[PDB]
Write a new protein. Structure first.
Lengths: 183, 97, 97, 91, 97
């Protein structure tokens, strides 16, 4: 029989890495209340250098979300321990796509949440991190295989400029698949 | 069982391996690092250089010292507990009061 | 909690890592470099070498100092703050007033 | 239908290097208002050496354009940061 | 803002990188070389070594000095100008009159 699936808001593949931290519901899916979002271009290894960020949230109380190509074992260790002790609630997810595409979506995530993209390929390092660069949302839920953002507080005008520019990037290139990914 | 360092050498005991105080409640994993704080348990006579007898060192037994885990640093087991042996040159500072 | 360096050793705290002031408003990227400026917070008695007693250091507690980040420079955590420990030999000059 | 496009005033190949910087219009293409242009014979890597130039622009506020054989990644980093933060607009 | 070197250390400012004097009117290019001439801006008290008090160095502020651009020479920014910091050991000669 024919089946129709419909995905509303922001949702895509790639779930969390460590199932050890969990929230109020079951099924493994983790929901956050007025969540905090961070995004990165490269992977990471040290965790102490993340002091200026994490501590800030520890002064804010708001739960955190992390986006990168990957996150190493000790980072998940600190994160899972800290979430288990209940001082700070954090989740981590590997980058969605590859090369230029993952970045091309990282910009839209940044603009949709309202924050600004951080990139190692740009002068700003993983060290240099401010409370303006990090994004904010109303609620986000991430399960084993898929991640979902429901509502970013980022204004619609920014989204307008972005959908404009992306559709402009659509009005070229041959084959379909490419146009399809852009769509 | 008490030990006896031979002049200029200081023997101190390590504290907690990477004492968890980062952030206040955040538990850091192991980044191939150690602890640099300790408490002095044994002290040698003093430096032997410059012939003129032996001038005592400036760290007394019972001092809480912060040091550098250099190359001269060795580990030993006394009464089935892990202790550290070093020199005064490798010792940096003392926490007072 | 105040600390006490053991002769010749100086403990200073770093300011801002590569203060963004190039051009006046322009933000400089990272050229794999750091900052060499600091502020003296703790000072040892003085150098003990050459036997003849202990000669005091020329750096007083509270000085804004420019130094060289050599090999003898070590890092430590006091009151959950990042501090740097060095020698007078690693210290180059002082900014006054 | 047949359409004629006409470009007035100097046009040639080779576009921007970093699509990271954008202006008021879309397409990634940047337009400049009463811009200043610099031209060089060699390549570049350092960014501090542009002091006598950038400072002038930092005293003018007006946007700059640069021409050389190429400009390296770290320079692209400094410029993209400066254009994104909105301190000075340069291509 | 004036600076103050701490003993044995000398702070001098470099002149022009490869001073245009080749031929008399010919402008020399860069052969991966630098300038070896400079002007001293600040001088420390003197060498502290050898215990016996502190003997002053033989370079006074205002001498035109030729040095060697070794490893111990560091660069700094004072009053938004590039200056060089070295020791008395690395400076080669002084041109007088």
């Amino acid at each position: 029989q024919d089946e129709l699936d419909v995905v509303e808001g922001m949702q895509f593949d790639r779930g969390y890495l460590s199932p050890y931290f969990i929230n109020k519901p079951e099924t493994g899916a983790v929901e956050l209340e007025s969540p905090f979002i961070l995004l990165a271009d490269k992977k990471i290894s040290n965790i102490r250098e993340m002091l200026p960020v994490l501590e800030a949230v520890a002064k804010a109380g708001k739960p955190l979300l992390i986006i990168a190509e990957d996150v190493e074992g000790e980072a998940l260790a600190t994160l899972v321990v800290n979430t288990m002790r209940g001082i700070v609630k954090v989740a981590a997810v590997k980058a969605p796509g590859f090369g230029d595409r993952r970045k091309a979506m990282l910009q839209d995530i940044a603009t949709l949440t309202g924050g600004t993209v951080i990139s190692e390929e740009i002068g700003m390092e993983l060290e240099k991190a401010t409370l303006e660069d990090l994004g904010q949302a109303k609620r986000v839920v991430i399960n084993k295989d898929t991640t979902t953002i429901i509502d970013g507080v980022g204004e619609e005008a920014a989204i307008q400029g972005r959908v404009a520019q992306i559709r402009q990037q659509i009005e070229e290139a041959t084959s379909d698949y490419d146009r399809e990914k852009l769509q | 069982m008490n030990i006896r360092p031979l002049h200029d050498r200081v023997i101190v005991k390590r504290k907690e391996v990477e004492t968890k105080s980062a952030g206040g409640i955040v538990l850091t994993g192991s980044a191939a690092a150690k602890s640099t704080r300790g408490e002095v348990l044994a002290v040698g006579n003093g430096r032997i250089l410059e012939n003129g007898e032996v001038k005592p060192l400036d760290v007394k037994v019972g001092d809480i010292v912060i040091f550098n885990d250099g190359y001269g640093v060795k580990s030993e087991k006394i009464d089935n507990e892990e202790v550290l042996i070093m020199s005064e040159s490798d010792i940096l500072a003392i926490v007072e009061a």
